[PDB]
């Protein structure tokens with residue numbers, strides 16, 4: 030293939046994690062909506078769409094490199110049963126995403142696939158943003174209490 | 184739970200097929216784009232998005248009925264290696280979708296879940312449309328030849 | 338020089354307090370934002386910008402009077418560790434600002450620098466407004482409780 | 492000079508390749524137009540202009556670094572005599588561009604000229620895009636036949 | 646903290662230099678205006694605002710990494726007494742900025758904080774732009790003479 | 800071939816001079832910009848683009864006449880080291896351009912290639928305009944002095 034095989038394999042790992050995140054965040058969105066917590070339903074939906082866009086770019090990059098995108102398998106979904114637990118499940122997932130993306134950055138650099146590096150660098154910045162937003166929600170549950178926090182996210 | 188357990192379980196079967204169809208069709212879109220056959224890339228993307236909307240509607244219906252939507256599992260993706268084979272892989276997938284939807288209609292009717300029936304009846308109408316479109320593409324390959332057919336779908 | 342030396346020196350005292358207030362308020366803004374308390378982040382940003390405009394007006398007045406604006410030095414920043422303490426740190430800072438401004442008004446009047454007096458009198462009016470706003474926030478924390486107060490300032 | 496001499500020398504190599512590509516793609520554009528294959532005439536023109544823009548940015552970067560941009564010499568032009576051969580000649584050229592750009596990225600990194608690195612990283616992404624487009628045209632000539640392919644590019 | 650401690654410390658160094666540059670350029674702006682050299686007053690103001698924006702992004706990045714932004718201290722201000730000397734003082738300052746930013750890029754890379762790296766890479770590009778503009782003004786004073794140069798910058 | 804071989808060969812001589820002029824003028828533009836003399840940067844850019852359009856028209860004319868445009872070779876670039884020398888280098892280049900164009904007009908007339916003659920006659924009119932502009936700049940340097948002249952072209 031035109032691309033580096035090891036780079037292609039790690040891009041498929043990143044895709045695996047994006048595919049997993051799409052489904053986790055999407056179900057979390059619809060669970061929050063079913064509960065009437067509509068603003069967190071929206072935030073989870075937006076991040077699900079963001080993950081879908083990430084996956085699209087990785088698939089297209091893998092195909093350009095003449096590799097085979099792997100959409101057949103998923104990782105473990107972390108599904109919470111109440112608001113605070115959902116947030117902690119998302120935190121667990123985004124940390125997995127970031128670790129995989131960081132290793133893709135490091136590997137692309139070593140193999141001199143600089144365009145791939147910049148692609149996953151762009152995704153990483155957004156994953157840090159979602160991690161930050163989740164951390165903030167946890168702290169706010171601490172500051173205002175879970176009853177006030179949910180009320181605010183209706 | 185408020186909904187019927189067998190109806191709930193068959194809705195998760197329909198969701199499984201939609202989630203699987205999402206990934207098959209989306210990959211086929213990007214492969215057609217990778218091959219330079221952009222009108223088939225676009226058609227496949229549109230059908231993937233429709234499957235995404237179908238899955239959304241089913242997830243929301245399962246949650247209202249107080250069941251647990253299952254997004255953890257995926258079926259076999261039928262991935263083609265050239266234009267004609269891709270179309271045949273899609274035909275195989277939509278036939279699986281339609282069969283699961285038909286059993287959901289029949290079962291929803293029996294259990295007097297008339298609102299679920301109407302939801303899955305609407306999805307069925309769209310699945311028949313995609314099936315018809317695929318049949319037409321295969322016939323057109325026969326009528327005009329694969330070289331003219333691909334040329335037309337650039 | 339064309340201006341009065343004591344007036345010039347007290348204007349640099351006012352500038353010192355504005356420069357210090359810029360940094361305290363700006364950091365408090367970004368800390369509130371980091372905590373998810375965005376309306377207090379916004380209020381603190383607005384007051385930092387006002388302090389930036391105050392400092393600008395004083396610098397321009399010192400230069401017209403042919404003195405040397407001193408931007409090299411900073412006072413103690415009072416940095417809080419939670420919402421209520423931040424507000425109290427700001428109250429301490431604005432009280433220092435107002436005291437320096439009041440001495441500038443009194444001294445400008447004595448030395449018949451009536452244009453400088455009016456400049457610092459305008460700044461004072463705005464500093465009293467920020468002081469009033471801070472007092473109100475503290476009272477509101479008392480009336481509604483810190484959990485409701487923070488919830489409201491998200 | 493303010494810049495690193497070795498970095499400057501490699502930037503002049505990249506410029507050499509951009510200057511060469513401008514002329515190859517431009518002549519190919521006008522040859523396709525002379526043949527009546529106007530859509531490939533347009534694609535070659537757009538890429539010629541893109542190469543001109545690349546050259547502009549490299550020249551300006553070399554001058555900022557206090558080096559001497561070398562516009563006096565050109566590399567070998569690969570000029571095809573029929574559609575498929577033209578595409579293969581462009582593929583040969585873009586591969587030369589990318590190799591020179593990749594070595595510029597690697598060298599800028601080692602010498603800690605991070606702004607130069609980002610400049611050539613941006614160009615590289617576009618060169619990969621043109622390489623991809625060319626690969627696609629070759630495959631389409633395979634899929635639809637050269638007679639249909641040219642017809643489509645009129 | 647979630648961030649790397651050494652990266653956080655170097656980000657605080659970059660902030661230190663941005664805080665210093667804000668004040669130097671701002672005073673230089675108002676000094677040029679006091680002298681009637683309004684176009685250089687404007688250029689210094691714009692760059693002061695640019696430095697303020699740089700500082701904002703670094704503060705927010707430090708807080709995201711769970712570090713403590715240090716706004717309490719400033720570096721030495723280089724304040725000129727006539728047009729050419731002001732420009733040379735700014736040149737001294739921007740070189741300090743760039744050295745600190747380059748070491749932040751190198752350190753972020755080593756510790757695999759790739760989003761921080763991209764943030765300071767973006768700032769660096771702008772600092773090179775201001776350095777270039779300053780170099781140009783010095784040369785123009787050489788070409789046209791200081792009397793013509795100031796006249797032009799009124 | 801459909802065109803006259805000697806006419807075809809002289810058209811390639813004109814193209815050679817345009818391609819050479821493109822590069823000289825474009826570099827002069829970016830050098831003037833690098834020096835802060837932006838109105839001369841702009842004037843030189845405009846003349847480079849005109850030379851690019853001239854080269855395009857000649858390439859298209861050679862191809863219609865079924866000859867082979869030669870873009871592989873370049874003449875001596877006359878690169879100045881200061882404003883006055885640059886202008887003199889441009890004067891030398893446009894004089895070469897005009898001489899090649901004049902021989903193309905005379906030869907096209909002899910061989911009754913009246914359409915080619917009119918094409919090169921139009922280009923000549925524009926080359927005389929650039930020659931006139933350059934002469935004016937040199938005279939203006941004499942009338943106002945180089946320091947005022949450069950000041951005016953900032």
Ligand code: HEM
Nearest residue numbers: 051052055078081082084085205206209232235236238239
């Ligand atoms: C499996 C990999 C998937 C990929 C690559 C993918 C890709 C995309 C893309 C590219 C878009 C358009 C984004 C935009 O234009 O703003 C989109 C939209 C959407 N996706 Fe997905 N998607 C995936 C899975 C899913 C799943 C599993 C669901 C539901 C559980 C879903 C639900 C949606 C919805 C509801 C939309 C909005 C469509 C619209 O309103 O137009 N997606 N997806």
Ligand code: HEM
Nearest residue numbers: 359360363386389390392393667668671694697698700701
């Ligand atoms: C000390 C760190 C500072 C930071 C982080 C900071 C930050 C900012 C920011 C983020 C803006 C808005 C920029 C925009 O939206 O375009 C701004 C504007 C401004 N700053 Fe600062 N600033 C600082 C210090 C100063 C100082 C010391 C002065 C005066 C000597 C100053 C004078 C101004 C002025 C006059 C404006 C324009 C405000 C307006 O017209 O809306 N700043 N600053």
Ligand code: HEM
Nearest residue numbers: 513514517540543544546547821822825848851852854855
């Ligand atoms: C040799 C190095 C060259 C450089 C750095 C260069 C640079 C440029 C630039 C910066 C533009 C404007 C792009 C834009 O604003 O969109 C341009 C336009 C153009 N160039 Fe070049 N160019 C070069 C050579 C050539 C050559 C050799 C030709 C012809 C064979 C050519 C033909 C054109 C044409 C036809 C245009 C469009 C101008 C217009 O319609 O405004 N260029 N070039």
